[PDB]
Design a protein around this ligand. Sequence first.
Ligand SMILES: CC(=O)N1CCC(C(=O)N2C[C@@H](c3ccc(C(O)(C(F)(F)F)C(F)(F)F)cc3)[C@@](C)(c3ccccc3)C2)CC1
Length: 221
Amino acid sequence: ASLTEIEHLVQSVCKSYRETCQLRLEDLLRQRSNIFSREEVTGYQRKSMWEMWERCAHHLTEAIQYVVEFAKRLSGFMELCQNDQIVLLKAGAMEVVLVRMCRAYNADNRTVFFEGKYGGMELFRALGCSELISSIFDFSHSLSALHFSEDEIALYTALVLINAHRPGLQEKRKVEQLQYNLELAFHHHLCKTHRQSILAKLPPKGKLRSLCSQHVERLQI
Ligand SMILES: CC(=O)N1CCC(C(=O)N2C[C@@H](c3ccc(C(O)(C(F)(F)F)C(F)(F)F)cc3)[C@@](C)(c3ccccc3)C2)CC1
């Protein structure tokens, strides 16, 4: 990787993200006026926690499937050994979904796109996860404040997944090298777009894994 090889990695990560983003950004922004009515919100609140869990678990499964496909398109990831592909997706997929959620979040009214319309955190009252759901919305709010672009999400989430510090890697030197190349690509693309500012404004990695860890615990109770 010299400079044109750095610039090639960027466009490839940004194309792979575009092809697996699940919902187009244009349709998320256009739908910000299609908000759940007061009556539709009550309908969600009256449902059992089990019904809301089956909905959310199946939406989380569909979101994770697109995260796997984004990785399966990453130049480098597909040459790793099967155990390494698995170890990276096991530790990183849920964090990637959390970062990805910021595109579907509207900071103007603290709502998220869910099942066809925008709804506040009150929509998920039946789960009994108000504290966890508040932190999820507050993390998405801190990423939406920065106006996180599609390509920033693409490169940033590629670094969330390609991390050599994951305990269980069989070829930790290969991941470290892919991680190193993605970092040059991310830091270079911030310079090309005059966005160097967002680095110090991004959430600390510990906050992303601590939010993810709490969410993983909720997946049982
Ligand atoms: C129709 C459509 O395309 N949609 C866009 C995607 C959207 C979606 O998947 N959701 C699920 C939705 C969501 C809420 C809550 C959870 C939980 O894990 C649950 F146990 F209930 F399963 C919880 F423990 F946290 F409570 C998972 C997913 C959403 C707000 C969300 C997404 C990602 C991360 C955090 C929250 C939005 C569902 C609607």
